[PDB]
């Protein structure tokens, strides 16, 4: 029963009921169904036309909000000393939603999701006072974010010839500009992303339980196109992801215990009464006590 | 050219904006959408599903012992069994539900809730309970005569081992807000108490103590508004293996 | 009327005296992969009444120290019957999995089992940062057992497990739970040896209790594929 519903449902006037054999208050939880009882059948009600909408709770309203997915800083200095490996005026990042608990827990209320992600890169720069205390100014640096599909050879350095971006989707943006915004389509080999995977990736026995290679959108490489200046800077790049055209299937319980890792659904639980393993809900004195009840 | 005026709020990145953005992958054909069972279009579909509450949220109860209320045969008449603070958006027996978890993502809520209680004693055990709901004003009732004055239901354990107490929408405003873990006029919902109507009579071969599981859902009247950040989750640092995602 | 139920699938049959109006997962009945949804351009085998015949797993004893039991599908029945043979000899499958959980106890017993079917129940290890292994997740027909059923062994609440296709076995009212499942996968077909579509968890919420002689109380589960079909057809492995 599709039944397009735009606002909440109204109530009707109720009268004294004494009919026997029909009992609306009694039901069967044993059946795996929710009680099909109206407020009319339990108490004596009045006619109430309800004008409260239901749009704020739509799944595309619930999920389509630009949430932080990554936050990584790197130096804009001249890297001569043999250190800072894989982070020398560039960084890479495998796009995953399981790194910041807000968007992760929100997306993990559904078993499958189908959306067109919209990425937004927000860049800030800051001078280094490593050997001094002098602020000379902030430069207008252009950055390049190349979207490398997962399983493809990413740029190993920032001077490499892999940045020419023959077919790879690339974007160039200055720090002074508005944040760079692009759209990634629903690029999954299946009809919906698998937020939860109950299998192993490959045929070999040890195949990284829980991680589906199809769910991984790709790989995001970010460098500074400019050459280094006589002084050093620290460039922080924040990525924001906003799902669009969302479809969601098979809702799930929300995560209660704190997340332990980005790879797996492991749990440890907090120490004290709230969100521990023994106790999820904070304790109270007894069942017949009120945590804070009015006393005048 | 067209003479253009730059308004305030141009260039700003509002994380709740709704605009079209640049296609990164041109002429991409998304996978044909198959039919998967269980599609959710509104989050108010999954608040209307019953879910156990932890009325026994005490220290002595650990794990699944917190999800049932052990009632016993009493020797004094008109005896209180338990009470449930109806705080739907602050820490309490209703915090870890489906309606409660979905509601802690929003500030304002409306509509009426339904409490369902299933009896998990033996078939040979009989009894009668009275589940009361008192509107927000005043203290929690401790005797049955003062608690019967609110909307209640008298329940007789029979073949139908589940009853429904409905908490009607009783408010002056259209909505209720969270605003704190506080006792405020536009935040409180009232109390739910359970007394013994007659007793829990049980034969000798049956177990003397019989548990009682309570469920809580939302009606069609329910509504939520002013979405926010849920407090049920939070991190103080980066999760494990998050640095491996950068290499 | 709604307490007497008979399920006839192939040459197998189940007759129940205390039923509870069997449920359907998400209001869906299994089907046969229509021509528009199908991607594998190859004639599938549809062995009916050879598979789709109510295979019965080994019973488990319900006690006081019991936390819960789970079986992953089709991992549980990947080695029994002609279903297991077709699963081995073929590369892809698509099945229905009608479930029936039997549990009996006298009128002086009290108890409650939450018989829930979780889709894609990716479970996590407790108190460690390492991911679960193969012999930890893949238990076969013996299934596993919950050690923290409070959090369903994934960090998510058990209280909210009634959002999944579920039924209860309240000993005072019914003694059986029957759940019908659809395909429920983002893919039209899947490799059965690595991935599990469903997870049948039986968590005793109210512990079994009686002041009688306390005789043994087993819990029996009967799985039945529905509208199962296979593609592939290479050697056994």
């Amino acid at each position, epitope marked *: 029963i599709e039944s397009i519903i735009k606002t909440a449902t109204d109530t009707v006037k109720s009268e004294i009921n004494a009919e026997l054999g029909v009992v609306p208050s009694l039901n069967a939880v044993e059946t795996g169904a929710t009680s099909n009882t109206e407020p009319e059948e339990a108490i004596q009600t009045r006619t109430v036309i309800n004008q409260h909408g239901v749009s704020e709770t739509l799944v595309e309203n619930f999920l389509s909000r630009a949430a932080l997915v990554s936050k990584r800083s790197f130096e804009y200095k001249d890297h001569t000393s043999s250190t800072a490996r894989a982070d020398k005026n560039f960084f890479k990042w495998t796009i995953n939603t399981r790194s910041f608990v807000q968007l992760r827990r929100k997306l993990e209320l559904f078993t499958y999701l189908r959306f067109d992600a919209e990425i937004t890169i927000l860049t800030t720069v800051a001078v280094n006072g490593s050997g001094n205390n002098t602020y000379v100014g902030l430069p207008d640096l252009t950055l390049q974010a190349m979207f490398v599909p997962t399983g493809a050879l990413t740029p190993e350095k920032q001077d490499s010839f892999h940045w020419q971006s023959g077919s790879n989707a690339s974007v160039f943006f200055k720090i002074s500009d508005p944040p760079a915004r692009i759209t990634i389509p629903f690029m999954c080999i299946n009809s919906a992303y698998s937020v939860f995977y109950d299998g192993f990736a490959g045929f070999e026995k040890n195949g990284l339980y829980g991680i589906n290679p199809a769910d991984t959108i790709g790989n995001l490489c970010v460098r500074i196109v400019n050459e280094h200046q006589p002084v050093g800077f*620290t460039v922080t790049v924040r990525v924001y992801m906003k799902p669009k055209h969302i479809k969601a299937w098979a809702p799930r319980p929300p995560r209660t215990l704190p997340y*332990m890792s980005i790879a797996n659904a492991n749990y440890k639980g907090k120490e004290r009464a709230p969100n521990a393993l023994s106790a999820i809900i904070g304790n109270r004195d007894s069942v017949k006590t009120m945590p804070h009840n009015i006393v005048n | 050219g067209v003479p253009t005026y730059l308004l305030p709020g141009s260039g700003q990145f509002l994380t709740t904006d709704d605009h079209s953005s640049a296609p990164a992958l041109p002429c991409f054909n998304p996978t044909p959408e198959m039919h998967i069972p269980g599609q959710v279009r509104n989050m108010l579909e999954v608040v209307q599903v019953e879910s156990m509450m932890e009325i026994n949220n005490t220290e002595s109860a650990v794990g699944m012992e917190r999800l049932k209320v052990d009632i016993s045969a009493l020797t004094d008449v008109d005896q209180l069994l338990f009470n449930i603070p109806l705080d739907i958006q602050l820490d309490g027996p209703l915090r870890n539900t489906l309606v409660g978890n979905i509601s802690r993502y929003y500030t304002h809520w409306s509509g009426s809730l339904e409490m369902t209680f299933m009896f998990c004693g033996s078939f040979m055990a009989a009894g009668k309970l009275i589940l009361c709901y008192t509107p927000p004003g005043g203290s929690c009732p401790t005797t049955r005569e003062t608690a019967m004055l609110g909307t209640h239901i008298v329940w007789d354990f029979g073949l139908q081992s589940s009853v429904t107490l409905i908490i009607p929408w009783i408010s002056g405003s259209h909505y209720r807000m969270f605003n704190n873990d506080a006792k405020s006029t536009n935040a409180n919902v009232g109390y739910v108490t359970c007394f013994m109507q007659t007793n829990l009579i049980v034969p000798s071969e049956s177990s003397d103590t019989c548990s009682l599981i309570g469920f809580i859902a939302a009606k069609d009247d329910f509504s939520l508004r002013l979405m926010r950040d849920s407090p049920d989750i939070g991190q103080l640092d980066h999760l*494990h293996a998050a640095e491996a995602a950068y290499q | 009327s709604d307490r007497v139920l008979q399920l006839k699938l192939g040459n197998s049959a189940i007759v129940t005296q205390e039923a509870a109006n069997y449920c359907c997962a998400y209001g869906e009945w299994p089907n046969y992969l229509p021509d528009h949804e199908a991607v594998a351009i190859d004639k599938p085998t549809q062995p009916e009444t050879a598979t789709d015949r109510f295979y019965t797993l080994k019973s488990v004893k319900w006690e006081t120290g019991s936390t819960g039991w789970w079986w992953k599908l089709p991992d549980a029945l990947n080695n029994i019957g002609m279903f297991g043979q077709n699963v081995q000899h073929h590369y892809l499958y698509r099945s229905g999995f009608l479930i029936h959980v039997q549990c009996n106890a006298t009128k002086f017993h009290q108890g409650a089992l939450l018989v829930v079917a979780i889709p894609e129940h990716q479970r996590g290890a407790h108190n460690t940062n390492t991911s679960p292994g193969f012999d930890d997740i893949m238990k076969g027909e013996e299934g596993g057992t919950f050690n923290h059923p409070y959090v369903l062994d994934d960090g998510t609440s058990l209280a909210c497990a009634t959002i999944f296709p579920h039924q209860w076995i309240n000993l005072r009212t019914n003694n059986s739970a029957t759940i019908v499942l659809p395909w429920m996968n983002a893919a039209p077909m899947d490799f059965p040896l690595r991935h599990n579509q469903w997870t049948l968890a039986i968590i005793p919420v109210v512990p079994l209790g009686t002041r009688t002689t306390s005789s043994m109380v087993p819990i029996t589960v009967s799985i039945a594929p529905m509208c199962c079909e296979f593609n592939g057809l290479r050697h056994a492995i």
Partner: antibody
Amino acid sequence: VQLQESGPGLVKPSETLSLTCTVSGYLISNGYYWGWIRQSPGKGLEWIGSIYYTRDTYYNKSRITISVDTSKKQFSLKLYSVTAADTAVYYCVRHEGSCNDGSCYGSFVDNWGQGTLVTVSS
Amino acid sequence: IQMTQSPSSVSASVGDRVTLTCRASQDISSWLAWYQQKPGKAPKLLIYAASSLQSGVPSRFSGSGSGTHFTLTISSLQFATYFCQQADSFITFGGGTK
């Protein structure tokens, strides 16, 4: 990565025990709690405290006031009222942990640095 | 938690199977790290999570199971103070040697 610390070693009668430590290979603003572990002859490998780049400062003894400065990529501690029991080696570490709740778990010291023998004399 | 890592200061010949044990007060999980402090220099993490090796470490070591016993095995001797850190509640560094 490379951790190098520097401060006064043989001159500290009762004053604040200031001591800094510059981080080289890793950006101190990406994670990996940064703290101090002193190998005292009196006890042997005691953990003083640590700090996250969000200035979280989980301590052991609470008079140390560890701080952080990602601008100069370094962090410091300050032992107050040092009297002859704080003569140690004072390593400067980073450790992969998770103090997400006010208590840490699984905090393993991957990078260690080198000692700074601090003497409380006179 | 107080890690009594010390049975003794054991001495072994080259090519032995010297074994160090680390007892814990609490029944901690597999949260256990083994460190090697060669004399005159800083310690180094040998194995963490009670069974996991490091990158750039000699593959002559192994770890025990969870709980309280927490042994350490060196398959070949080819010399340093070996420390035992619990890292379940905080950093403790149970004192011990070889």
